[PDB]
């Protein structure tokens, strides 16, 4: 906790760099997660699900 | 540029015989064409004053010098707005163009520059 504080939080430059890097990761992973979840709840309905017939 | 700088460089020139022989006559002509004496100013009246250092130097003027400076500034402003020049006793003669302010500003700046140096001292 001391170590974590000292490296990522104590300097605001490091804190902001960690926040921005986390935002980048969140953005990419959340995108992928929602895409999969949306595809499962709407399964068989979307064009991607019927496209194979054509 | 600081008044300190200007004064030191001037003193280098005034020392060199060659340099003074060529610079002093030019400087006198420059001052004649400048024409600030025709509005009844002394050279030092023209120095920019909106600086902490200059405000401190002006506060250290003797009251008489200070009251006379205020009058020259008001008088020159009235010539400026009227588009007239000084005549007669209002024209600053070369012998009246004294550096009344230079000693005060040099002392203010001396301390200011010493303070900057001493703020950067390193114990050896």
């Amino acid at each position: 906790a001391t170590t974590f504080y000292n490296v990522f939080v104590k300097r605001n430059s490091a804190f902001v760099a960690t926040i921005l890097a986390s935002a980048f990761v969140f953005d990419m992973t959340f995108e992928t997660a929602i895409d999969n979840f949306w595809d499962r709840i709407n399964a068989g309905k979307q064009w991607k699900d019927i496209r194979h017939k054509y | 540029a600081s008044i300190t700088s200007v004064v030191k460089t001037s003193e280098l020139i005034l020392k060199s015989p060659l340099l003074s022989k060529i610079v002093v006559p030019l400087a006198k002509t420059y001052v004649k064409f400048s024409g600030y004496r025709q509005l009844g100013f002394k050279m030092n009246d023209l120095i920019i004053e909106e600086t902490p250092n200059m405000q401190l130097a002006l506060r250290r003027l003797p009251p008489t010098e200070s009251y006379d400076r205020v009058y020259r500034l008001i008088r020159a402003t009235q010539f400026s707005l009227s588009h007239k020049l000084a005549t007669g006793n209002d024209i600053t003669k070369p012998e009246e163009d004294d550096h009344y302010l230079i000693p005060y500003i040099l002392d203010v700046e001396a301390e200011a520059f010493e303070k900057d140096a001493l703020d950067n001292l390193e114990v050896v």
């Binding site: - | 540029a1 008044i3 700088s5 200007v6 004064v7 460089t9 001037s10 020139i13 005034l14 610079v23 002093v24 030019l26 400087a27 006198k28 002509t29 420059y30 001052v31 064409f33 400048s34 024409g35 600030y36 509005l39 002394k42 050279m43 009246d45 023209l46 120095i47 920019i48 004053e49 909106e50 600086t51 205020v70 500034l73 008001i74 020159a76 402003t77 009235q78 400026s80 707005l81 070369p94 163009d97 550096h99």
Partner: protein
């Protein structure tokens, strides 16, 4: 206590237009600030009125301007007033900036109003450039094409940025509709920055032609400068009248009365006259990116005047050598303007390069040298 002082809203107006303490010796070059405010008011009134009759779609834009000229009551006047006042706006802004440079208005303690002023000047250029495209004549289209393609020089992303600005792969309807929306907005941004530079100025007050403090001798803004401003307002309105009513197209390009045609290229594609010096500077550098940088630097270099002027005295009234150098700098700026509209031919190519070097060397070499030497001459000459 008088209401104009007691009420906070009235007191703000009071502080700027009535009790504002001014130097008693401002000369007529201090009148360009109120002329610029007048141009801004005319451009807002005429511009909003033109927007009530103009159609931003590329299929109708040029014809909507002809409808304004032909069918709208007094539309010819509103259109000519708006187009001519754009030129007057630049004459007044060059005069105001020239005043500021000659009298040392950029020096402490007025660095902030000067620096915001440089941004005002950039916003005026953008505003005027977008407004000129809206006619959608030949110069409108081809000027937009060549000026927007300068952005292609930005490394890596330049081409992408251009397509993004255009909203397509060439200047077309998307570009015209966005330029309309931005041309309408930019004058409001410009008014805010104009207000900001005055609020920044209010901490020191106006400088004056002698370069000394005026704290010793102040005059109220009203009635003295109100009535002195009326003289230059009526002089300006006389010049306005001569162009708008008797020669409305003297400052324009005939090619802008031909509808935009992406196929035919006009003989010579030049900016409006007030952009010409910056175009000559761009031509001087052979590299595309080089030229763009030089052209932007030519405006941003105004930001270093507070540093490169090493004088212990504010302004040029008492500095014969600085006055000569300033005279050469101004005439060089006019020559750059002329060279901006000549053909790229001998011997104007080399001349444009020499004038460009002179332009930059004023800021980087001559003004620092001359201002240093004059400091020494004032000191030695008055001993």
């Amino acid at each position: 206590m008088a209401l104009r002082k007691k009420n906070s809203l009235l007191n703000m107006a009071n502080s700027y237009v009535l009790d504002s303490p001014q130097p008693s010796n401002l000369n007529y070059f201090w009148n360009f600030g109120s002329l610029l405010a007048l141009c801004l008011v005319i451009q807002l009134a005429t511009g909003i009125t033109l927007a009530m009759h103009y159609t931003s779609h590329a299929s109708l834009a040029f014809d909507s301007v002809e409808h304004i000229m032909r069918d709208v009551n007094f539309g010819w006047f509103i259109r000519y007033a708006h187009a001519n006042t754009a030129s007057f706006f630049f004459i007044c802004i060059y005069a105001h900036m020239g005043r500021n440079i000659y009298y040392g208005s950029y020096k402490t303690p007025r660095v902030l109003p000067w620096s915001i002023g440089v941004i005002i000047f950039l916003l005026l250029i953008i505003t005027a450039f977008m407004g000129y495209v809206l006619v959608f004549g030949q110069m409108s289209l081809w000027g937009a094409t060549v000026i927007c393609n300068l952005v292609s020089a930005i490394p890596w992303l330049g081409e992408d940025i251009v397509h993004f600005l255009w909203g397509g792969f060439s200047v077309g309807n998307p570009t015209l509709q966005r330029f309309f929306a931005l041309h309408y907005l930019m004058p409001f941004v410009l008014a805010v920055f104009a207000l900001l530079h005055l609020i920044a100025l209010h901490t020191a007050g106006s400088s004056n032609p002698l370069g000394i403090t005026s704290n010793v001798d102040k005059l109220s803004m009203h009635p003295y400068y109100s009535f002195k401003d009326l003289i230059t307002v009526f002089a300006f309105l006389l010049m306005f009248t001569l162009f708008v009513f008797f020669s409305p197209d003297k400052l324009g390009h005939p090619d802008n009365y031909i509808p935009a045609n992406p196929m035919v290229t006009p003989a010579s594609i030049v900016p409006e006259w007030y952009l010409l010096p910056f175009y000559a500077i761009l031509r001087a550098i052979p590299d595309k990116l080089g030229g763009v940088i030089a052209m932007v630097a030519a405006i941003l270099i105004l930001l270093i005047l507070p540093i490169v002027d090493r004088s212990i005295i504010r302004g040029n009234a008492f500095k014969p050598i600085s006055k000569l150098l300033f005279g050469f700098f101004i005439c060089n700026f006019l020559l750059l303007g002329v060279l901006g509209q000549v053909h790229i031919e001998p011997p104007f190519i080399v001349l444009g390069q020499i004038c460009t070097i002179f332009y930059f060397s004023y800021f980087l070499i001559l003004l620092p040298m001359v201002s240093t030497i004059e400091n020494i001459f004032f000191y030695i000459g008055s001993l």
